[PDB]
Amino acid sequence: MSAQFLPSILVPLVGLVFPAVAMASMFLYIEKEEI
Amino acid sequence: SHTVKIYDTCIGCTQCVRACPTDVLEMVPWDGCKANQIASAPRTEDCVGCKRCESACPTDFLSVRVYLGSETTRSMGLAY
Amino acid sequence: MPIADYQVFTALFLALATGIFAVRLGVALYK
Amino acid sequence: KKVKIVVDRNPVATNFEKWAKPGHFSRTLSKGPTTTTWIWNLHADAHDFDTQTSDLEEISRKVFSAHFGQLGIIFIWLSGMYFHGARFSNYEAWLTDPTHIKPSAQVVWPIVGQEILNADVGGGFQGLQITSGFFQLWRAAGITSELQLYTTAIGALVMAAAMFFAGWFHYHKAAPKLEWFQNVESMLNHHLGGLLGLGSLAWAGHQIHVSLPINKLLDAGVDPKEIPLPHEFTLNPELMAQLYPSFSKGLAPFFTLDWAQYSDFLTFQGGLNPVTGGLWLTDTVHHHLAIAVLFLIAGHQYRTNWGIGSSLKEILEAHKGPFTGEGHKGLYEILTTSWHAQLAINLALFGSLSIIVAHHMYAMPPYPYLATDYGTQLSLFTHHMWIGGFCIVGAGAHAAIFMVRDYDPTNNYNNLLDRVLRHRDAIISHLNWVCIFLGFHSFGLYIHNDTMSALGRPQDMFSDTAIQLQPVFAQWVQNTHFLAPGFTAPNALASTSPSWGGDVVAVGGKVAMMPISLGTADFLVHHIHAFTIHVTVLILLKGVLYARSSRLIPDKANLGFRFPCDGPGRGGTCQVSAWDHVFLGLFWMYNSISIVIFHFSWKMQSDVWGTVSANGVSHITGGNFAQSANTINGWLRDFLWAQSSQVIQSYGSALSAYGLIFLGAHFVWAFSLMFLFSGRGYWQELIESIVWAHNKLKVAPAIQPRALSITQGRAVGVAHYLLGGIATTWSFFLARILAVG
Amino acid sequence: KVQVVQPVNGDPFIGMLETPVTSSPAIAWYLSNLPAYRTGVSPLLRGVEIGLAHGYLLVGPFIKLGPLRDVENVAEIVGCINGAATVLILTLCLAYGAVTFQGEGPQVGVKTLSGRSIPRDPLQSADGWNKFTAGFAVGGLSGAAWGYLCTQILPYY
Amino acid sequence: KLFPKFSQALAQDPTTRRIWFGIATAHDFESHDGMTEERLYQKIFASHFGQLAIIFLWTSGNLFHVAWQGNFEQ
Amino acid sequence: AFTPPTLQSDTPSPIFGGSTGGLLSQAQVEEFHVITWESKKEQIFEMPTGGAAIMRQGPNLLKLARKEQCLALLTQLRTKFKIDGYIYRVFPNGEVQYLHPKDGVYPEKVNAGRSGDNTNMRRIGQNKEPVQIKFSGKIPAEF
Amino acid sequence: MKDFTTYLSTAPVLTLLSVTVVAGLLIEINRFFPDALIAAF
Amino acid sequence: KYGEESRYFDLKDLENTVGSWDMYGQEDKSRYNGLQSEFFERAANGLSRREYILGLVAIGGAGILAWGGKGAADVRLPTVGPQQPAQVGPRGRL
Ligand code: CLA
Ligand code: CLA
Ligand code: CLA
Numbered sequence A: 001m002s003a004q005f006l007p008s009i010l011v012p013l014v015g016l017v018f019p020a021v022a023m024a025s026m027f028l029y030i031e032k033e034e035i
Numbered sequence B: 001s002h003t004v005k006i007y008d009t010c011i012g013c014t015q016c017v018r019a020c021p022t023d024v025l026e027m028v029p030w031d032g033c034k035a036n037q038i039a040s041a042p043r044t045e046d047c048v049g050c051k052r053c054e055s056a057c058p059t060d061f062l063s064v065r066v067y068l069g070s071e072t073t074r075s076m077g078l079a080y
Numbered sequence C: 001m002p003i004a005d006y007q008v009f010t011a012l013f014l015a016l017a018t019g020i021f022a023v024r025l026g027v028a029l030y031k
Numbered sequence D: 001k002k003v004k005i006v007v008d009r010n011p012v013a014t015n016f017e018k019w020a021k022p023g024h025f026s027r028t029l030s031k032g033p034t035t036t037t038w039i040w041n042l043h044a045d046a047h048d049f050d051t052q053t054s055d056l057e058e059i060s061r062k063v064f065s066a067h068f069g070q071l072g073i074i075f076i077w078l079s080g081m082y083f084h085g086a087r088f089s090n091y092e093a094w095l096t097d098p099t100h101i102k103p104s105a106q107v108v109w110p111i112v113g114q115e116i117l118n119a120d121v122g123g124g125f126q127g128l129q130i131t132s133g134f135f136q137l138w139r140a141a142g143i144t145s146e147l148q149l150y151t152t153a154i155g156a157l158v159m160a161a162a163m164f165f166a167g168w169f170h171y172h173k174a175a176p177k178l179e180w181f182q183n184v185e186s187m188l189n190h191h192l193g194g195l196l197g198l199g200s201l202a203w204a205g206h207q208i209h210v211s212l213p214i215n216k217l218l219d220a221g222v223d224p225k226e227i228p229l230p231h232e233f234t235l236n237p238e239l240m241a242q243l244y245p246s247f248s249k250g251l252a253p254f255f256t257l258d259w260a261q262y263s264d265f266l267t268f269q270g271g272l273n274p275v276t277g278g279l280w281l282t283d284t285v286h287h288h289l290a291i292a293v294l295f296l297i298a299g300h301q302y303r304t305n306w307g308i309g310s311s312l313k314e315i316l317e318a319h320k321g322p323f324t325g326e327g328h329k330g331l332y333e334i335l336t337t338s339w340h341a342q343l344a345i346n347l348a349l350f351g352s353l354s355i356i357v358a359h360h361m362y363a364m365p366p367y368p369y370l371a372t373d374y375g376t377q378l379s380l381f382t383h384h385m386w387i388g389g390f391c392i393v394g395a396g397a398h399a400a401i402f403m404v405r406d407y408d409p410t411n412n413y414n415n416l417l418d419r420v421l422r423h424r425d426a427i428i429s430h431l432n433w434v435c436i437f438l439g440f441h442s443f444g445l446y447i448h449n450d451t452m453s454a455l456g457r458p459q460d461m462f463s464d465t466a467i468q469l470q471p472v473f474a475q476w477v478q479n480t481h482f483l484a485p486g487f488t489a490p491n492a493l494a495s496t497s498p499s500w501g502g503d504v505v506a507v508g509g510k511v512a513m514m515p516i517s518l519g520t521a522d523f524l525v526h527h528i529h530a531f532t533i534h535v536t537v538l539i540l541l542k543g544v545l546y547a548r549s550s551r552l553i554p555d556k557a558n559l560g561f562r563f564p565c566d567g568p569g570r571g572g573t574c575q576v577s578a579w580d581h582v583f584l585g586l587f588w589m590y591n592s593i594s595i596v597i598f599h600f601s602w603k604m605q606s607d608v609w610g611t612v613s614a615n616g617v618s619h620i621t622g623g624n625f626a627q628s629a630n631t632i633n634g635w636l637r638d639f640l641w642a643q644s645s646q647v648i649q650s651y652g653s654a655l656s657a658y659g660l661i662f663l664g665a666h667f668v669w670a671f672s673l674m675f676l677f678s679g680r681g682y683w684q685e686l687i688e689s690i691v692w693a694h695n696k697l698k699v700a701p702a703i704q705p706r707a708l709s710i711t712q713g714r715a716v717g718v719a720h721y722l723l724g725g726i727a728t729t730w731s732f733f734l735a736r737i738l739a740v741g
Numbered sequence E: 001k002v003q004v005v006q007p008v009n010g011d012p013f014i015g016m017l018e019t020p021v022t023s024s025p026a027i028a029w030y031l032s033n034l035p036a037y038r039t040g041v042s043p044l045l046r047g048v049e050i051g052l053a054h055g056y057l058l059v060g061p062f063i064k065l066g067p068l069r070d071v072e073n074v075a076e077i078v079g080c081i082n083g084a085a086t087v088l089i090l091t092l093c094l095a096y097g098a099v100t101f102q103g104e105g106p107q108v109g110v111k112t113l114s115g116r117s118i119p120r121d122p123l124q125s126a127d128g129w130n131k132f133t134a135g136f137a138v139g140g141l142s143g144a145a146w147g148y149l150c151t152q153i154l155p156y157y
Numbered sequence F: 001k002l003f004p005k006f007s008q009a010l011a012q013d014p015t016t017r018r019i020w021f022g023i024a025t026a027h028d029f030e031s032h033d034g035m036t037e038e039r040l041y042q043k044i045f046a047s048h049f050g051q052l053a054i055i056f057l058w059t060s061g062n063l064f065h066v067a068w069q070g071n072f073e074q
Numbered sequence G: 001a002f003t004p005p006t007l008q009s010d011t012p013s014p015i016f017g018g019s020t021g022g023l024l025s026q027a028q029v030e031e032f033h034v035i036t037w038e039s040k041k042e043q044i045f046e047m048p049t050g051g052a053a054i055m056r057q058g059p060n061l062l063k064l065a066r067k068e069q070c071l072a073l074l075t076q077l078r079t080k081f082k083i084d085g086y087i088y089r090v091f092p093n094g095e096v097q098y099l100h101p102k103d104g105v106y107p108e109k110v111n112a113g114r115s116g117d118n119t120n121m122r123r124i125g126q127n128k129e130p131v132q133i134k135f136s137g138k139i140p141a142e143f
Numbered sequence H: 001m002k003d004f005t006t007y008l009s010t011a012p013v014l015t016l017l018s019v020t021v022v023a024g025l026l027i028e029i030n031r032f033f034p035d036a037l038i039a040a041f
Numbered sequence I: 001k002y003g004e005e006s007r008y009f010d011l012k013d014l015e016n017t018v019g020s021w022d023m024y025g026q027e028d029k030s031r032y033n034g035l036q037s038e039f040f041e042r043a044a045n046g047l048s049r050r051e052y053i054l055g056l057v058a059i060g061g062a063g064i065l066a067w068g069g070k071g072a073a074d075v076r077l078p079t080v081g082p083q084q085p086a087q088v089g090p091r092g093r094l
């Protein structure tokens, strides 16, 4: 496939960075007291 | 905080009041039944929703109804 | 003729723009 | 004061007046069957004597008579077993060839092609292969002939009639008073020595004068029809001396304290008999004599009508320490006035004993030609395991019942029960944590192995080849037992069981017993067993400890022991009673026992049972347990899928019945799901529509049909779930073992 | 005649009991001398100590059980793994601090077992948790770094 | 404790249920606080547009993955 | 002529050895309840939190978490020892609010002078249809 | 005697006796007329 | 609480009647050495702000991407390594 390096960067981004960021943001938002 | 309602079909048997485990209902004077008393729910904030009052009502249909609504620290029966 | 790397990069950029439009629609729906 | 026989004359009249009035025992069942719920309530409270009356004397009398009736039923069952073994069996032929003829004691009639179930067991006989082990028991007892079995069956019928008469006599003629039942000291003294001790001594006597000579001749090789009759050995010291020379001296050595002379028939060898594959009958005789003496001595500790003896109340009240405040005070009053507490203790120890029996019986086969009978071994082990599990769950249920009805705070102040009830939160929280830790470190290991195997990384698994989890403690104990003879047991010629190690004991070309090596798979399965047992204990203990009150419901005791809930308030109180805790504990017990029996079956088929061909041992499954039991996929494929081919291919043969039940059980189990995932409202409304249809045609019944109560729905669901699962395992086990054993 | 189990601070209507496991003199001293129970010590220093200990004890597991445990470069890979774990539990501490401390309220006072009034732990504050979280990062990363050095040094190992 | 922006009653729940029910009742626009018929229809219309865009993106992703790492030509 | 009786802090508590089912951290930041009764003798009773306590001869005070626990204890005292008690609600700030015997007369007995709160003058089936009150944060029972 | 006959007339006793009689009749029908796949008259 | 006898309730000392005790806390400012404490508080100077401390966590996110694009290949991960031959399939397929 063209640009074999792309999956090695996108898979961890969508499975590790994006989920951690999304969970942290959701946790901080669902307990804001004043949204 | 559940919604407790009393209807004119009540006969004033006072069974629902005795069956309440959180003291939510009480008997007040009335003139629509032979007992000359009607049930009331002045402290609905303390109602947990056990529906014990409905299991004791002998009228058909029930004269006392509990509609579960927004849950609070008291309605959920939480001691922690 | 397999797709080249530049094509993948262009597709990813267009997807980024589409995602921006999607987040804008989501924000509008939240309001 | 003073233990005596106190009885009331003619308390209940004998007539059929109450037989025509169903529901006479209950006061709430007097308004008649207005709805169908009355019919179910009639059976759900038939044996709940605590509700039928408030007098403890009447309850005790009812329990005594019920016990007599149960004894009569058991005697009828025993009589049927002996009669079938004497008229519809091949026991006589099996005696001449116990290694090739398969025991059979049931014959079916030819009605709708079912005669195919009459298998060719052997000895010119056709019937159903039995796995109860009655043939081995009878052989160990020296039955030899079928006339003796018929005589035993008739005697059992007479005993059943005597038991029923005893129950009727003690309930309608001479009913014991309450003070008679509360004689725990006298009851224990009689049950220890007069029952267990005397029974063991009598059995030892029979074994000495009947089992030893007949079995010795059978083992040496003599036709069963040529062996002398039991009375010819019991009343003739000359022949018995010909078989056992120590008998030429009579009873003189016993009274002169020169017991060594009796070493020929009172040995302490060990291991198993190489001819029959079972324990040495002389060793069993010595064991029974020793335990009989021990029990007889133990039956003299409690005080009765004389000064000598100990007092249960005095001993209990004297055991108090700094960590338990008052101690065991009040326990005597609880165990002498509450039948449920005694039932709980007895059921717990009784079930534990049944489990111990299953273990000791497969480890050390006590009957001749029993170890080589793989079907009988597996059947006995599984049956006793299930009985033990059920009894334990019942023990928890009755403990909760006592805590709900017979508990009295004024009598249990600062004692063991009160202190336990005052810190139930800590107990439950710690048990919950240990259950979670065990579940993780036990099941997650299997999941990790599955993931590694699927990812192509077998070197990262928890196996004997990669990360090893050797059970060093179990292996050490096993080797210690193997080295016990001549060291920590000088008078022992061999170990208790060949499983500890040593040579292979094979009978008739089949392995009767051999060392059982423990590896990583054994470690994993043992931790799985510990985890399941802990979860079951957590459920039962939580129900017993919170049966009275809880933070959610402070007056749970007022609602009773068996109630569906406390409404949808507080988020939901569904299944909050103790009965519901027992309902869930039943499922967890089923899961635990199922895993236990699966482990036993696979381990014996892969590392014990097999054939000897002068070149090694050819196990049934080839030893795939040590390399596949570390993953769930291995259990599903190498055990469930591989061993199920025997039951799914039994159609058209004698084992076809096992193939039918195997499916039928699968149905019942699934049927249970209907009652487990549903509610009462849906069925009540559906019944309303059906009732309208009936009313439209003037065929509506007066006994208003009602949906099963919430508690009844749960009971039906759990009963069907366990029946289906247990029957499925039963059919699978029996078909597999009867086709490859 | 001695009763080693007493109600918590003599009050028998509080969901707690005093046992030789909770009220033991040595156990109480050791538990009270931990960095978490230091009302008078700066939260940053306590966080540094906690992070150092946790980061150091967190290398071992991956060293002897990681996917690359059978390779000479296992120590480095594990040092990085512990650093990642420390950073993860770091963001966990930050999220907990941002959610827990976001408002103020006239809370009830705090006293000792004897009845001596003491101020609330500064760690239970918006700025107190932030300082504690920052110290945990420096200490946690340092502990993981020291874990790799110990592998290279330590003549026995 | 005010995440269920569409349900003021759920926001007052001090238990974890507030979060649970806060996600299971997000699409029940008719039961949200201060909801009218016009706003309900407009929200549904916009949600339909979002769903259509999601379907188009899914199809585009399938095509892109087949053309990038597949063997369609072979 | 009834006035809510004030809560005396000098009332001794029943003899109890302690338990893990007592007050937690909710009573420090939310609220708790107090039940005070009068006993004619020192006797053993069952506590709603588990275990057995001994009520002294005279005034007794017991602090619990939920109001249901206090009411359950009161029910036990009324149906077992024929003892009448009073329940109060205490907040962390220090406010005491009278509860259960609101007007000195038990709720099961009519007192003539109470509030007839939540009492509809219709039948259960005479409520408004759910479609007639759509787009309104109210149930048919509140009309 | 009246009470005994009344007990024998109860729903469970009558149900078991009726089921036993029906099962016995069917078993004997299949014993004397076996393998009746169709109604050959 | 004024628990001088059997009274565990006190409105004037309601703080002690709700079990609000530290149990193990102890205030003491004499422990960590001044020279070592200064070093650590100095190292974690500006890292006490939510935005700045999150930045340190963001570095971990960059390391994750760095591992996939470089770290995974340097540890010779099987997924980033090569492949050997292949199979045909059940029938005449590929
Ligand atoms: C819904 C369609 C869809 C789906 C299910 C997938 C799924 C996948 N993609 Mg892909 N992708 C898509 C669309 C999709 N893609 C489109 C339209 C493009 C063109 C720009 C790409 C370009 C792309 C590349 C370059 C790569 C992947 C890769 C992957 C694989 C790993 C995911 C990853 O980390 O990459 C990240 C994916 C992206 C950065 C772009 C995807 C954006 C889509 C459209 C978001 C859709 C969100 C959805 C509609 C809303 C659902 C809600 C949900 C988020 C909770 C994975 C199997 C990687 C791979 O090949 O693995 C070996 C890889 O390197 N995709
Ligand atoms: C013909 C003899 C006879 C007669 C006329 C009576 C008559 C009476 N008995 Mg009695 N009893 C008898 C024998 C008799 N009994 C025997 C032998 C025992 C010892 C077990 C008892 C023990 C006994 C007790 C403990 C009690 C009575 C009671 C009673 C009175 C009402 C209960 C009743 O009978 O309901 C009807 C009972 C039945 C119709 C049968 C009961 C169910 C049987 C035993 C089940 C057998 C199991 C069977 C194998 C099926 C299980 C498996 C199956 C699923 C295949 C009644 C006047 C009760 C009483 O006094 O009322 C307060 C009382 O509690 N009896
Ligand atoms: C040496 C005296 C003796 C013996 C042998 C027994 C034996 C037995 N008792 Mg018993 N008991 C005794 C003394 C004795 N008891 C005394 C002194 C008291 C008063 C404190 C009691 C009070 C008592 C109660 C309350 C109960 C028993 C029960 C039982 C049976 C338990 C069933 C079992 O698992 O055993 C195995 C079963 C057998 C071995 C069946 C064979 C039965 C033979 C005939 C033994 C009969 C022994 C008997 C005492 C002989 C005297 C009776 C005579 C007047 C005809 C069992 C047969 C329980 C029971 O099931 O009720 C029947 C039960 O509920 N006992």
Ligand code: CLA
Pocket: D043, D044, D045, D046, D047, D048, D049, D347, D390, D391, D392, D393, D394, D395, D397, D401, D562, D579, D582, D586, D719
């Ligand atoms: C010595 C053993 C023993 C004894 C004497 C008792 C005695 C008692 N139990 Mg108990 N129990 C036991 C063991 C025992 N139990 C065990 C082992 C368990 C675990 C399963 C339980 C769990 C249990 C519960 C949960 C409850 C009791 C209850 C009771 C009381 C009322 C029983 C009753 O009349 O209900 C009626 C009896 C029946 C309806 C018999 C039905 C038999 C089952 C449902 C059918 C099973 C099928 C069978 C295996 C055959 C299948 C073939 C089929 C296809 C035909 C009673 C005093 C009840 C109670 O309220 O206590 C006060 C209560 O709810 N028990």
Ligand SMILES: CCCCCCCCCCCCCCCC(=O)OC[C@H](COP(=O)(O)OC[C@@H](O)CO)OC(=O)CCCCCCCCCCCCCCC
Pocket: D319, D320, D321, D322, D323, D324, D325, D327, D328, D416
């Ligand atoms: C693997 C062992 C299998 C058992 C599981 C152990 C886990 C259970 C842990 C729960 C502990 C709860 C504490 C209760 C606290 C408690 O009960 O109060 C303390 C208790 C009370 O004793 P008293 O002084 O009151 O004694 C007066 C008594 O007569 C009245 O109870 O004394 C004990 O210490 C009991 C021992 C508990 C510890 C049991 C462990 C025993 C070790 C056995 C080791 C076996 C293997 C090694 C052999 C070589």
Ligand code: SF4
Pocket: B004, B019, B020, B021, B022, B023, B024, B025, B046, B047, B048, B049, B050, B051, B052, B053, B054, B066, D569
């Ligand atoms: S639902 Fe329960 S708490 Fe509410 S009024 Fe009825 S009985 Fe009282």
Ligand code: SF4
Pocket: B006, B009, B010, B011, B012, B013, B014, B015, B016, B017, B038, B039, B053, B056, B057, B058, B059, B063, B064
């Ligand atoms: S139970 Fe029903 S009839 Fe009786 S007082 Fe209450 S509402 Fe009226």
